[PDB]
Write a protein that holds these residues in place. Structure first.
Motif, PDB file in Angstrom:
ATOM      1  N   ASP A 105       0.833  -1.210   0.000  1.00  0.00           N
ATOM      2  CA  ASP A 105       0.000   0.000   0.000  1.00  0.00           C
ATOM      3  C   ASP A 105       0.866   1.258   0.000  1.00  0.00           C
ATOM      4  O   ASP A 105       0.625   2.202  -0.747  1.00  0.00           O
ATOM      5  N   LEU A 133       1.425  -1.335  -7.948  1.00  0.00           N
ATOM      6  CA  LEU A 133       0.049  -1.827  -7.962  1.00  0.00           C
ATOM      7  C   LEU A 133      -0.818  -1.173  -9.041  1.00  0.00           C
ATOM      8  O   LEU A 133      -1.970  -1.560  -9.217  1.00  0.00           O
ATOM      9  N   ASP A 134      -0.262  -0.211  -9.775  1.00  0.00           N
ATOM     10  CA  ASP A 134      -0.986   0.454 -10.855  1.00  0.00           C
ATOM     11  C   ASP A 134      -0.555   0.020 -12.254  1.00  0.00           C
ATOM     12  O   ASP A 134      -1.221   0.336 -13.235  1.00  0.00           O
ATOM     13  N   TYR A 193      -7.325  -4.547  -6.843  1.00  0.00           N
ATOM     14  CA  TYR A 193      -6.236  -4.067  -6.015  1.00  0.00           C
ATOM     15  C   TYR A 193      -5.797  -5.122  -4.985  1.00  0.00           C
ATOM     16  O   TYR A 193      -4.611  -5.436  -4.865  1.00  0.00           O
ATOM     17  N   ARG A 231      -4.042  -8.003  -6.688  1.00  0.00           N
ATOM     18  CA  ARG A 231      -2.694  -7.614  -7.109  1.00  0.00           C
ATOM     19  C   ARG A 231      -1.717  -7.637  -5.930  1.00  0.00           C
ATOM     20  O   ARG A 231      -0.553  -8.005  -6.092  1.00  0.00           O
TER      21      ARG A 231
END
Length: 182
Positions: A27, A34-35, A53, A56
């Motif tokens: 995070d 993560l994008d 999300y 992933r």
């Protein structure tokens, strides 16, 4: 509930806490990781673009655990002197779960204050996430040698560099056969 569980939960007593840490650290330190929708998803994770999300995060925790398997076999104490030098001309010492060294690691902002900090598995895994966050997001892919240059995590880790060897072949096979990927 999780669909994919990292390999270190099978091998080490503290593996569940490693996972908890990695989900949190993804995070905070892996928002670019993560994008990304990686260009080599057809190899590593065919359904990657469909992943949420949370999925992933589960994916990357698993891939990290497969990297740890072949870098250190989950040994946070591991310290291995390489055949290449740091900026002082001294042999690089690779440390901990992902076999990161202090000079190269700190260039990513990992903030290791002592060599001992690299043997803290949580700091080691956080640094790995920073390294992936940089290169996977810059290069738009997980690995591969493209037009003469290693890309993504293959910039840093030998186990992600394609070749006829157990580590790379296993990492790719285990990744692409995750239920969320296949």
């Amino acid at each position: 509930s999780r669909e994919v569980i990292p390999l270190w939960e099978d091998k080490v007593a503290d593996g569940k806490a490693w996972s908890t840490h990695v989900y949190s650290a993804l995070d905070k330190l892996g928002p670019n990781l993560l994008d990304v929708i990686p260009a080599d998803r057809s190899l590593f994770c065919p359904k990657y673009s469909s992943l949420s999300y949370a999925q992933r995060k589960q994916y990357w925790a698993f891939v990290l655990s497969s990297m740890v398997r072949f870098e250190s076999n989950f040994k946070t104490a591991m310290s291995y002197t390489e055949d290449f030098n740091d900026s002082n001309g001294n042999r690089v010492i690779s440390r901990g779960l992902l076999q990161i060294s202090i000079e190269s690691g700190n260039a990513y902002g990992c903030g290791f204050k002592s060599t001992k900090d690299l043997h803290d598995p949580l700091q080691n895994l956080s640094c790995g996430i920073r390294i992936l966050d940089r290169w996977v997001s810059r290069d738009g892919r997980i690995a591969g040698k493209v037009d003469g240059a290693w890309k993504g995590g293959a910039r840093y880790w030998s186990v992600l560099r394609a070749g006829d060897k157990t580590s790379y072949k296993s990492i790719v096979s285990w990744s692409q056969n995750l239920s969320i990927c296949k």
